[PDB]
Design a protein around this ligand. Structure first.
Ligand SMILES: *[C@@H]1O[C@H](CO)[C@@H](O[C@@H]2O[C@H](CO)[C@@H](O[C@@H]3O[C@H](CO)[C@@H](O)[C@H](O)[C@@H]3O)[C@H](O)[C@H]2NC(C)=O)[C@H](O)[C@H]1NC(C)=O
Lengths: 48, 17
């Protein structure tokens, strides 16, 4: 929902959405290749 | 401000919190 929302917020006010009590498919998100750049400074994609 | 939110005589209704 957040990534594929019809309107993506501008740089002026980057919207903050809080997700809780959810199963996080971080591996699936990494698997998605449409996003050009997936960079983790402080996390490990394998460990995510 | 809502870190967590969940939405969805004849009787006695007990409870323990
Ligand atoms: C949840 O609690 C209340 C809900 O009514 C709101 O608190 C406001 O949140 C801001 C930032 O989100 C906080 O700013 C604080 O202001 C002090 C004094 O100006 C400053 O030293 C800091 O910058 C501090 O973060 C503050 O708790 C409060 N705003 C004000 C003007 O008092 C808010 O909706 C929610 N967040 C927090 C943190 O309470």
């Amino acid at each position: 929902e957040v990534f594929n929302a019809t309107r993506f917020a501008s740089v002026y006010a980057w919207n903050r959405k809080r997700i809780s009590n959810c199963v996080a498919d971080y591996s699936v998100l990494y698997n998605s290749a449409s996003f050009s750049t997936f960079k983790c400074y402080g996390v490990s994609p394998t460990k995510l | 401000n809502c870190t967590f939110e969940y939405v969805s005589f004849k009787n006695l209704r007990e409870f323990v919190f």
